Design an enzyme around this catalytic site. Sequence first.
Site, mmCIF file in Angstrom:
data_model
loop_
_atom_site.group_PDB
_atom_site.id
_atom_site.type_symbol
_atom_site.label_atom_id
_atom_site.label_comp_id
_atom_site.label_asym_id
_atom_site.label_seq_id
_atom_site.Cartn_x
_atom_site.Cartn_y
_atom_site.Cartn_z
ATOM 1 N N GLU A 212 36.465 21.512 61.241
ATOM 2 C CA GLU A 212 36.996 22.768 61.755
ATOM 3 C C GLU A 212 36.905 22.730 63.385
ATOM 4 O OE1 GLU A 212 36.008 25.708 58.043
ATOM 5 O OE2 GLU A 212 34.536 25.596 59.874
ATOM 6 N N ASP B 42 41.114 29.925 55.936
ATOM 7 C CA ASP B 42 39.968 29.572 56.901
ATOM 8 C C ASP B 42 40.835 29.074 58.177
ATOM 9 O OD1 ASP B 42 37.982 29.946 55.302
ATOM 10 O OD2 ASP B 42 37.664 27.824 54.772
ATOM 11 N N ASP C 260 27.437 19.558 58.829
ATOM 12 C CA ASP C 260 28.511 19.836 57.863
ATOM 13 C C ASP C 260 29.635 19.030 58.039
ATOM 14 O OD1 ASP C 260 29.493 21.014 55.558
ATOM 15 O OD2 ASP C 260 30.083 22.891 56.862
ATOM 16 N N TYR D 216 35.727 32.901 64.707
ATOM 17 C CA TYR D 216 35.862 32.417 63.656
ATOM 18 C C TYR D 216 34.330 32.187 63.390
ATOM 19 C CZ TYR D 216 36.346 29.153 59.722
ATOM 20 O OH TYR D 216 36.150 28.754 58.548
#
EC number: 2.4.2.6
Lengths: 156, 156, 156, 156, 156, 156
Positions: free
Chosen positions: D97, D71, D91, D6
């Site tokens: 994530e 996502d 970020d 990913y």
Amino acid sequence: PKKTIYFGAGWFTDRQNKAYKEAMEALKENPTIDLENSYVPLDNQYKGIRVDEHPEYLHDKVWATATYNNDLNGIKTNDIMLGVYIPDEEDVGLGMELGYALSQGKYVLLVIPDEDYGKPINLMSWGVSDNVIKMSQLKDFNFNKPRFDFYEGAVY
Amino acid sequence: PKKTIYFGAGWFTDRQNKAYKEAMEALKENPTIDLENSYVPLDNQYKGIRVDEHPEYLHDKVWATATYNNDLNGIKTNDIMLGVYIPDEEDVGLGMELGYALSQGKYVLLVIPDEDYGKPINLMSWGVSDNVIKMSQLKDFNFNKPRFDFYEGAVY
Amino acid sequence: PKKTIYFGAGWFTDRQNKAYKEAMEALKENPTIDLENSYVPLDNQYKGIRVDEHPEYLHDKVWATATYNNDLNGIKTNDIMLGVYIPDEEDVGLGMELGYALSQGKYVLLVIPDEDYGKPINLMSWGVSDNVIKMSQLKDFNFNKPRFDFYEGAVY
Amino acid sequence: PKKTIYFGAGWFTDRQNKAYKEAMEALKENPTIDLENSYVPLDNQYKGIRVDEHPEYLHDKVWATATYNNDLNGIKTNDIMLGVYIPDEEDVGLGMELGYALSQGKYVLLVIPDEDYGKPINLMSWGVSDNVIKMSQLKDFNFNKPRFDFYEGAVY
Amino acid sequence: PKKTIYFGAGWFTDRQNKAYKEAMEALKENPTIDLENSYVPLDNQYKGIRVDEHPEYLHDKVWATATYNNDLNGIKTNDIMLGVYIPDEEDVGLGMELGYALSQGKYVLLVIPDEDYGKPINLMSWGVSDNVIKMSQLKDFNFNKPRFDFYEGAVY
Amino acid sequence: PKKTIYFGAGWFTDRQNKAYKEAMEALKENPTIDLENSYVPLDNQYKGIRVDEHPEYLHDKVWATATYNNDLNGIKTNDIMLGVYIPDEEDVGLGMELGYALSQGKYVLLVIPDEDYGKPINLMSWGVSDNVIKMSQLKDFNFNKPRFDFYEGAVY
Ligand SMILES: Cn1cc([C@H]2C[C@H](O)[C@@H](CO)O2)c(=O)[nH]c1=O
Ligand SMILES: Cn1cc([C@H]2C[C@H](O)[C@@H](CO)O2)c(=O)[nH]c1=O
Ligand SMILES: Cn1cc([C@H]2C[C@H](O)[C@@H](CO)O2)c(=O)[nH]c1=O
Ligand SMILES: Cn1cc([C@H]2C[C@H](O)[C@@H](CO)O2)c(=O)[nH]c1=O
Ligand SMILES: Cn1cc([C@H]2C[C@H](O)[C@@H](CO)O2)c(=O)[nH]c1=O
Ligand SMILES: Cn1cc([C@H]2C[C@H](O)[C@@H](CO)O2)c(=O)[nH]c1=O
């Protein structure tokens, strides 16, 4: 296709080290196992240090953290959770890993030496396993089609 | 506030049975523990029968399934995972349960008898634990504000 | 009833520090919050030392491991995941914690200073959140009946 | 064997977009990576719409829902969670994530530009990672044998 | 102590609606249940509108997303997962929720109308359940000490 | 590369058995699916016994336990969770499996017969799915690049 495994086996007793070598051999012959990309704890101790072989690290928080995390990574990162199980010498560490494997959604296979198969095993080890086989069944076990099955033995 | 616990403790050796009694006494004195609504395995084996008292159950999948499931339910519905730990007689069952408790996001507290506090413990047990204290501190431990801490001892 | 929270809030800029104080004041006024038994990161760094006050800890794996673990323990043992969020100075640490809170099945509430309520927020933050309110509503928010709601604002 | 990833990377700053291209290139050369079947967020925004490029969607609940879910699907559905990390421009989205990847049991690899490697990173990003490497190490990284390792750098 | 529940019950047939009312009455009589702070789906559909009363919402992704998310939030923030179960009219929605409750580690209790207690139930429902009782026992069930038990009935 | 699947389909109605055969056929032709190493429930009932075909097992706790666990193993052990969905005949068992698949982090694909596509489906089935397609799209669906998408239909 081929599957990788987390080689969960102790190395603190003669019976344990005996089964370790046996299972290693069985895996080495099994067609469905990609042993090269598998994770084996003994070859992945932090900095190659084995604490039983270097008692100075018996109090190293960093060595423990690193090895513990490495083992966990070895579990979630591989397909099957294989546990080399000795009924008379049950390992607490392997137990914790069986539980962690469950959480990670891995197939849990316990392999017991043919001479010990049938002897009573702990209720929890029995319940967390997806299948329990004999050492002799290891070489031919088809890891691409893992199925659930009860242990033909006693559970205390 | 008061928290409920899952009483993780073996009862297979004299040292374990001794630690079992001491811990139960310490917990009865702890003002932050609600022992009545906690889960004690020994009082929750399926059909109320212990396999060591009725060996005929050593080969009864139904007994094994229900007891295993009831134990899991005991961990998931309770606040704290308590593990009475004897370094020289580590329990595979307790180990699996530590892993399972981790998966359920419970605070994992190991309690070691004072006389043994400091002896080496399995890496995997040290890793899952959020803290490890000695039996004598149990009666005063504040379960309403559990915090993380390292074992002031060795780990093999 | 009263719920406990994990105080997710950065303290690296003046806007963050201002929001930090306002939120702490609102929480002290909330009748449904038990602040004494909640977990505040700043009062829980390992050994009680903040790395910004003692830069020597910037290179100490043990400090990092314990503080990280204590924070995780703070989220998993508490009822609500509170995230003081400043749209123009979003925190990677708070982000990781939102993801972790989601994994533990906690209610995730973002609280944005009134003056900033409405400004664009990162998609991933909007997604994990169960609700997002302004600082002024915090003192009255009923944590005993948390419900889902969309951010009345933009998301980039 | 080959692994998919990913591609977790921001695209909101010049330093970020620089690293993005670099990492993309490194992956394109790495033998252990099946880049074709990997998921890259920027090419999977709902309806091909990039909100930074179409501010009218800044309030589209359906666009946000779809992209956020896409996502997440990109994460659980792939082998490795790769995060392109810029110490000075951390970020929040990537943070969330990383936490989600942890829950999904994925290997978390942070890759920092060679010029930034060593600079302090957030405590949580450090703790959720299984390993932190330099951009130059990306092309040769063996994803079939992912191992745990500490970041040779500072953590605030 | 008192526990909160998520009221899992369909309302799409007369038998379901009848069981729904009986269960709500039994719960109001249970001293161990805090019904005020529990989550009742029917009073929590997005915007307070039921699609069967306002069919225009049958094609509204925003309504569907919020209601779905609010339901999940209702399960994860509550103590017990209650499923009013009608053997002859099993609900796919309730089924998904049982699975979800299992993932969150909640006690899953099925309650079947007395007249139907004993009829065959889907294997998967029997499996996720921690216990299954008849409507008449609901008013007395002790939710502070939930324990595991097998359905005294058939399973297809 | 090729992916394996857990064939989630009912077999209790004519419409169900019709779709079952159709989907089976579509999968048999799809290039991205390794159907040989996939798990199909009907061929994995404990001891090859189908209870609808042997009502004596309607009360066998051991048959139920074994089959239930085998199905769960079939889910966590395979790549994709495929659900053959009939809007007018929604299955509770499939529902539970969708939820379990979610917990296991699997891609959830619902496939609806072309004649039924568009009809209203349960809110939860809609929300747990990563994508909903028509029977005719099954043969060409690219499982190596699974993406998220909304159901072009109504949800009650
Ligand atoms: C005690 N101990 C244990 C382990 C792991 C590895 C093995 O599967 C199991 C053996 O106890 O736990 C390890 O890696 N190192 C170590 O020192
Ligand atoms: C072997 N065994 C084990 C347990 C559980 C309980 C304790 O936490 C630990 C002891 O191994 O596991 C039990 O309930 N019954 C049983 O017979
Ligand atoms: C960078 N950093 C971060 C945290 C935690 C706490 C807060 O929720 C958020 C701030 O990034 O993450 C902490 O405990 N210590 C630390 O030094
Ligand atoms: C803000 N933002 C963010 C993301 C995801 C993707 C990336 O890994 C990380 C960047 O913040 O989060 C996305 O897909 N779209 C978007 O608009
Ligand atoms: C179909 N449907 C379903 C639910 C939830 C609620 C109940 O537990 C069960 C009924 O299917 O799922 C809901 O909130 N709204 C809706 O319209
Ligand atoms: C009722 N029933 C159900 C199942 C599983 C399998 C399928 O995906 C779904 C069908 O209900 O649940 C099974 O294996 N056996 C059975 O008897």
